[PDB]
């Protein structure tokens, strides 16, 4: 039998008993006072312990106001807990709906043949913080501070971009509590709870789980698709999307959140970009006096061009093609749940959420293209000087350009992919500079050593991503670090005859230098896994170029004044770049909400942060290091290859 | 005001008028006759034309039986059409629910202030075809033939694997009509229409859109996760997921479907696998008399091993690492919507849906490992014979092994990825055999030519996938085909001096041979895009090895009887392999339902189809072709390199 109850507007908690096989229909008449009133109706099952063995849905509640509707099926079962009380939000009535009256209908049923007591909570949350995103003339930023969020009273906004003349929009949520919450956004026509065919395929709803920070970027193309959005903030009752351990799953914890809503206008960062190019083009004047003037004073390739390793480009270009496919097929809402930027220092350009991280890689392209051009132009000598490193200096400029393609692609969506490919091209540039100085006095160094160098770099960075969740990953690196460095110490003595002068102290310097690094990242959690292999290559590259320079003065060979300047600029730029690299703090083993909570502001001009200066000083470091090795043996330009000392 | 109506069980169509701001509550009392009765309640808006300008949801209908519930929000808007009549299925009551009576409650509302006429259709579809998947003792396959499917009466099954002792399960749907339909499957506890947090991330519902065939594989690990499933078949009212063109979006078309339910037991295919290994190990006896006996009769590497191109392995191993990540992160339900197998010839092993397509690539691994071992073992001569191709014959065996890794990885999930990587390693094996015969009389062929060969293969197959949707993609291939072949014809005359004897007819044979192929795939839609570049490499490889053999008799050099046998086995095996390759019929430009409709049965032993014999005869073809080039110049073993003719 069906029982109809008339419920007043004053009644906020409704306690009734659902007799066996009885249906309760509760009605609340709605008038103009309910326009833009976001209402939450929740149901409680009194004496939840009585229904422990009863499986399935014990109580069914359906709430409707004629415009929106939802279903409350209790218990609502989560992976960790079962809740015998839950509610949902009813999209408010609008002035179009309103003499004539709307009405709020709640229907309660149960398949159980026993009597069931329940409680209905009708919560209102409106009149502010809903209808807040209305921007007055000449205003671009609005702020809500310390808005309280409970499991009973969620937060919810409505954004009409057609009404507010909004082209791009940014939402930021600040919280100091580490309490799990959810940021749900959908188009106004869509429903949070209503599933659509091909859910994962066609999905316009974004659910960002956060603790201390969360960011929403409504791109200009997304605003035009829907023209209006609904933003909701809920407390996650299960902390799985934000924490790995199960801790006090059942709780009643309030959460204070601060909001910032930006009305973004498309802009060109002409001042930070021009000042970045002036800073990057200034050190290229070192090429002018020594390298370029020789090209002025002077005025089979197909055998070298078809045997040159061009499959070293494929690891980077096949990653770029896959990351662009994964980016253009993703929906506008999926790009916010998937890509993890540092939104305190993320400046957008179109759909790109961090343009500063993409354009700051232009020093690698600029310098890499100069390394290729100058090496090709300055190869015009067979009896005097050291052997010309023309094709290895072109390979260093290729990986300098590839590092700009690999990093600009990582910064489009920084998600936890199998092959990271932000740093790895730096590790090849550093190993190629050691291969150059290894053979420069023996022979003309071959770019064929890039294959074993790149395969070892690509295989090692995939081996760290695969075992990153494990506890012994830093030991897997250390045993490879010893095997790789113990092989180089054995390759040196076999080549140089194990002389006590040069070979005996090369081994101790590299054994103590690399063991001091292993003790730092193995016995101490000094660096992150993404930074461990990159710091080890830079230190070994610097240690070898310092050994090569220390051996040069020990053999009574003078280092030119220019090579000492470029050598000190190489040490200085690698230390400044390594200081900004040390501040990345990106671990893909932690939860998505902990990866979102990390926010470090911009250091310079509102555009450059610690990461963008690592891109800028990593290319300066690669520039000055390339200019040092190219100038260090200029005093030997008139010495016969037979007289030249070999180390 | 709320109006309560009592509706009898005889009333199948309910026509009422929803007055302005009135709520109708309709009740149907349910008794034991409704156990396992899957019911569909649909609502119609009479005079749909009256509500054309009214936006949003005009009518709201909520149906519940105490155990299940749903919401009908009319009009249900699809991308192409708006439907003013739709319904959903109510999960049936069970004997646990049943003196005591259940009841079916329908609630009707409208936000409109005008009167609205509606019709309620209560359709029953049960007592057979629901509770049909009960398997009697000793029965493993059940079949339903020509089950009629309409938009008003959908199909729906219930599978209890705990009750039926089912470990693995396969569902197949056969239809001869090209009418769009949907195959929806979910766990019994889950709901088709109830959305879950992180929908795309945590999704156990599979929606397969099909026209003529659809397949479901319940793996052993999925059966254990849920233990019971609900299978539904609906007619897609919008044909977007199955057709590209909008055609008669509104229709009332019946569809006849045939079902086949298999109770699969885990099995080892010992007979097809052993007979495949006997067939693959038999032709290895050609290595025994000539190659191996020399190794018996006879009884700097680090310079070649560190300069050997090992970055040619990275394109294939970095694709395998990405396809395994995309496979282990996918849910059990997503692997059926994403991977497109030929399920008429797909034999499963564990989670792998096509084990026959993975294990038939073992001839590439077997032969590739023999190519590596024999080449390394038979390099022990500098004045007699042709130049030893030791490191290029190892590179051919590396890409022979890589083709087994690249194809076994493609067959785990054949989805439309950016880089296909099923054939491309064959194109390098065919180009490496031309590089071998190009230089074998000039010098020792270098594996360094693999870089430009692999980069061109990888770049070309990505260029076809990128432009596959376009209409001019076969012209993009043809201009690259002419540029590549016109470069080889120019490289031949520059090397051989443009002699009328050998160079003048090499150009005409390769210009007419490659233009005859272009006319076939450009002016005719002969091959698929996946097969175009692979057929062009095989024909040029065969044309060159035939030119090399025709030049050999023109220079009065005898071809040994064994090399003529292996040469005829190379032509025969490339024609048999090319006959099974021609039958792939995989186009990623067509709809997913058209990619699912393709089903070609197994040819041999219930295990081998056209594709699996392409894997088997593609390795025989690569075996016999490798044995031909290794034996063709054995008559020159006692001829000085100065006397040896060069062509
Ligand atoms: C968001 O705001 C816009 C603009 O204020 C709304 O657009 C108007 O919609 C009414 C119907 O309700 C039309 O009669 C007007 O022509 C529209 N005005 C303009 C300037 O286009 C839009 O409907 C609103 N959408 C939501 C979800 O509230
Ligand atoms: Zn970076
Ligand atoms: Zn294949």
UniProtKB/Swiss-Prot annotation, chains A, B:
Biological processes annotated in GO: dsRNA transport; regulatory ncRNA-mediated post-transcriptional gene silencing; RNA transport
Extracellular side: 1-274, 326-356, 403-414, 468-470, 526-530, 584-612
Topological region Cytoplasmic: 436-446, 492-504, 552-562, 634-647
UniProt-listed InterPro entries: SID1_TM_fam
Tissue specificity as recorded in UniProt: Expressed in most non-neuronal cells, including body wall muscle cells.
Its biological purpose: Plays a role in RNA-mediated gene silencing by acting cell-autonomously as a channel for the transport of double-stranded RNA (dsRNA) between cells. Mediates the spread of dsRNA and subsequent silencing of genes in cells distant from the site of dsRNA introduction. Selective for dsRNA. Preferentially binds long dsRNA, from 50 base pairs up to 700. Short 20 base-pair long molecules are not bound. May also bind dsDNA, but with lower affinity. Binding may be sequence-independent. Required for avoidance behavior induced by small RNAs derived from pathogenic bacteria such as P.aeruginosa.
PANTHER family, sorted: SID1 TRANSMEMBRANE FAMILY MEMEBER, SYSTEMIC RNA INTERFERENCE DEFECTIVE PROTEIN 1
The name this protein goes by in its record: Systemic RNA interference defective protein 1
Encoding gene per record: sid-1
């Amino acid at each position: 039998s069906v029982l109809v109850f008339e419920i007043s507007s004053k009644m906020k908690m409704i306690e009734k008993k659902l007799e066996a096989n009885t249906v309760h229909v509760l009605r609340l008449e709605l008038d103009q006072s309910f326009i833009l009133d976001l209402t939450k109706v929740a149901a409680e099952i009194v004496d939840s312990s009585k229904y422990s063995k009863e499986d399935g849905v014990i109580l069914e509640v359906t709430v409707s106001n004629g415009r929106d509707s939802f279903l409350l099926k209790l218990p609502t079962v989560y992976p960790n807990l079962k809740l015998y009380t839950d509610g949902k939000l009813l999209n408010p009535l609008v002035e179009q709906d309103f003499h004539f009256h709307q009405n709020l209908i709640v229907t309660v049923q149960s398949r159980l043949n026993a009597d069931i007591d329940y409680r209905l909570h009708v919560t209102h949350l409106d009149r502010a913080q809903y209808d807040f995103l209305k921007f007055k003339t000449g205003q671009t930023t609005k702020t809500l501070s310390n808005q309280k969020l409970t499991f009973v009273k969620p937060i919810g906004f409505f954004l009409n971009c057609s009404e507010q003349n909004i082209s791009q929009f940014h939402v930021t949520l600040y919280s100091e509590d580490d309490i799990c919450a959810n940021l749900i956004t959908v188009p106004a026509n869509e429903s949070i709870y209503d599933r659509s065919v091909i859910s994962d395929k066609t999905h316009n709803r974004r659910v960002l789980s956060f603790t201390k920070r969360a960011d929403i970027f409504f791109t200009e193309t997304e605003i035009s698709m829907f023209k209006s959005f609904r933003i909701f903030v809920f407390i996650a009752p299960d902390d799985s999307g934000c924490s790995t351990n199960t801790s006090r799953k059942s709780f009643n914890e309030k959460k204070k959140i601060s909001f910032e809503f930006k009305k973004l206008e498309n802009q060109s960062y002409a001042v930070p970009t021009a000042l970045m190019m002036i800073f990057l083009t200034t050190p290229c004047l070192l090429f002018l006096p020594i390298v370029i003037n020789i090209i002025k004073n002077s005025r089979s390739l197909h055998g070298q061009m078809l045997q040159y390793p061009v499959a070293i480009i494929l690891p980077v270009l096949m990653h770029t093609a896959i990351e662009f496919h994964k980016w253009t097929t993703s929906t506008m809402a999926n790009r916010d749940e998937m890509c993890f930027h540092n939104h305190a220092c993320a400046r957008p350009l179109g759909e790109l959420r961090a343009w500063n991280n993409i354009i700051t890689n232009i020093g690698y392209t600029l310098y890499g293209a100069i390394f290729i051009v100058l090496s090709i132009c300055r190869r015009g000598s067979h009896v005097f000087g050291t052997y010309e490193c023309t094709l290895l200096d072109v390979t260093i400029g290729v990986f300098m350009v590839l590092q700009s393609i690999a990093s600009a692609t990582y910064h489009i969506c920084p998600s936890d992919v199998a092959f990271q490919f932000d740093t790895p091209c730096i590790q090849v540039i550093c190993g190629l500079l050691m291969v150059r100085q290894w053979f420069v006095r023996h022979e003309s160094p071959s770019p064929a050593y890039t294959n074993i160098l790149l395969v070892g770099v690509v295989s090692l960075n995939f081996l760290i991503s695969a075992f990153s969740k494990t506890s012994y990953v830093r030991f897997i690196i250390a045993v490879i670090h010893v095997i790789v460095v113990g092989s180089i110490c054995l390759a040196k003595e076999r080549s140089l005859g194990s002389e006590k002068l040069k070979t005996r102290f090369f081994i101790m310097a590299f054994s103590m230098g690399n063991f001091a690094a292993i003790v730092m990242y193995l016995t101490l959690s000094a660096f992150h896994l993404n930074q461990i292999a990159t710091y080890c290559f830079i230190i070994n590259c610097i240690m070898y170029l310092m050994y090569y320079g220390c051996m040069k003065v020990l053999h009574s060979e003078r280092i030119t004044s220019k090579a000492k300047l470029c050598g000190a600029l190489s040490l200085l730029a690698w230390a400044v770049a390594g200081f900004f690299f040390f501040q990345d703090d990106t671990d893909w083993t932690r939860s998505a909400a902990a990866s979102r909570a990390l926010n470090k502001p911009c250091l310079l001009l509102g555009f450059f942060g610690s990461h963008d200066l690592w891109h800028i000083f990593g290319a300066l470091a690669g520039l000055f290091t390339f200019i040092f090795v190219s100038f260090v043996d200029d005093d030997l330009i008139n010495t016969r290859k037979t007289s030249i000392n070999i180390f």
